[PDB]
């Protein structure tokens, strides 16, 4: 009296994970840097003692410096009793500065052509912010993670001017994956320059 139990469990974990408000703040001071952590102050926003602890993979914090100003866009993977938000990556430098189009295919047939599904005002953003916004767009529009939707496979391709495509699995989780397991991939703090962005291709399958 049950079918496609796993894929349904996988989608459940994903649905739980991405239905969240992101930690989004601009022009924040890096109070301290360790080998794998950014300690960022957002007290001015919170009007209270408040910080963001972003954990990343080796040698990422080495590209930044204490007291540098950065923008944050990360998904919290855990909640505590402290005034601290815990995320992976999502840190980009605040530039002097401070048009996303693509297509969507379902089982080989292009449904959307040159759509502008999301918006990013940063000239430099993390794939984490992009990935998040596309998934929310897909969850909102096609309920890709709802157990009763026919979508069971998917890819998000990102084309960058003067470089090969980059593909990301949209159903990247197991039945026992927590938010932390699913967001761990963002520890690479992968970043993109808006000017270098060409377009994206969303591929969804029901089979």
User: In the complex, what is the shortest distance from the CB of residue 57 to a second copy, in angstroms, rounded to a whole number?
Assistant: 24
Partner whose binding site includes residue 137, from Zn ion, a second copy, none (CB under 5 to 8 Å by kind): a second copy
Output the smallest distance, CB 140 to a second copy, in A. 5
- How many residues sit close enough to a second copy to count as binding (CB under 8 A)? 18
What CA–CA distance (Å, rounded) separates 193 from 197? Answer: 7
Residue 148, judged by CB atoms within 10 A of its CB (0-12, 13-18, 19+), counts as exposed
The one among 84, 159, 160, 194 contacting Zn ion by CB under 5 A = 159
Which pairing describes strands 197-205 and 51-55: parallel, antiparallel, or unpaired?
unpaired
Of 60 and 144, which CB lies nearer to a second copy in the complex structure?
144
Beta strands in 99-163 (DSSP E): 102-106, 109-115, 124-126, 153-160
**Residue 36 assigned ligand-binding role:** no
Provide the angle, in degrees to the nearest 10, between the axes of the packed helices 5-18 and 127-142.
Answer: 120
Q: Smallest gap, in angstroms, from Cβ of residue 161 to a second copy?
A: 27
d(C-alpha 172, C-alpha 140), whole Å: 18
Using rule CB under 8 A, residue 23 touches a second copy: yes
Task: Identify whether the C-beta of residue 103 lies closer than 8 Å to the C-beta of residue 110.
Answer: yes
Which does residue 159 bind out of a second copy, Zn ion, none, counting CB within 5 to 8 angstroms by kind?
Zn ion
Nearer to Zn ion, 120 or 159 (CB): 159
Q: Note whether 70 binds a second copy by CB under 8 A.
A: no
3-state secondary structure of 4: coil
> Any contact of residue 172 with a second copy (CB under 8 A)?
no
> Do residues 30 and 40 make contact, with C-beta atoms less than 8 angstroms apart?
yes
Pick from 103, 136, 149, 193: which binds a second copy (CB under 8 A)?
136
Residue 158's beta-bridge partner residues?
A: 166, 200
Q: Which does 101 bind (CB under 5 to 8 A by kind): Zn ion, a second copy, none?
A: none
Q: Is 174 in the site for a second copy (CB under 8 A)?
A: no
Q: Residue 90 binds what, of Zn ion, a second copy, none (CB under 5 to 8 Å, by partner type)?
A: none
Is residue 99 within 8 A of residue 86, CB to CB? The reply is: no
- In the complex, which residues of this chain contact a second copy (CB under 8 A)? 16, 19-23, 47, 76, 79-81, 117, 136-137, 139-141, 179
Which residues does the annotation place in the binding site for Zn(2+)? 165, 199, 201
């Amino acid at each position: 009296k049950s079918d496609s139990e796993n894929i349904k469990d996988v989608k459940l974990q994903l649905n739980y994970a991405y239905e969240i408000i992101p930690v989004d703040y601009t022009n924040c001071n890096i109070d301290y840097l360790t080998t794998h952590d950014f300690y960022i102050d957002i007290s001015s926003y919170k009007k209270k003692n408040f910080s963001v602890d972003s954990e990343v993979e080796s040698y990422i914090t080495t590209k930044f410096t204490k007291n540098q100003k950065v923008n944050i866009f990360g998904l919290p993977y855990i909640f505590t009793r402290y005034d601290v938000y815990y995320i992976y990556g999502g840190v980009t430098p605040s530039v002097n500065s401070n048009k996303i189009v693509g297509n969507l295919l379902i089982d080989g047939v292009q449904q959307k052509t040159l759509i502008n599904p999301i918006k990013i005002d940063k000239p430099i953003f993390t794939i984490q912010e992009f990935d998040f916004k596309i998934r929310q767009y897909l969850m909102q529009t096609y309920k890709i993670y709802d157990p009763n939707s026919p979508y069971i496979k998917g890819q998000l391709e990102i084309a960058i001017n003067g470089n090969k495509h980059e593909s990301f699995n949209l159903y990247d989780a197991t039945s026992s994956s927590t938010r932390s397991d699913i967001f761990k991939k963002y520890k690479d703090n992968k970043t993109i320059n808006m000017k270098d962005f060409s377009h994206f291709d969303i591929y969804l399958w029901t089979k």
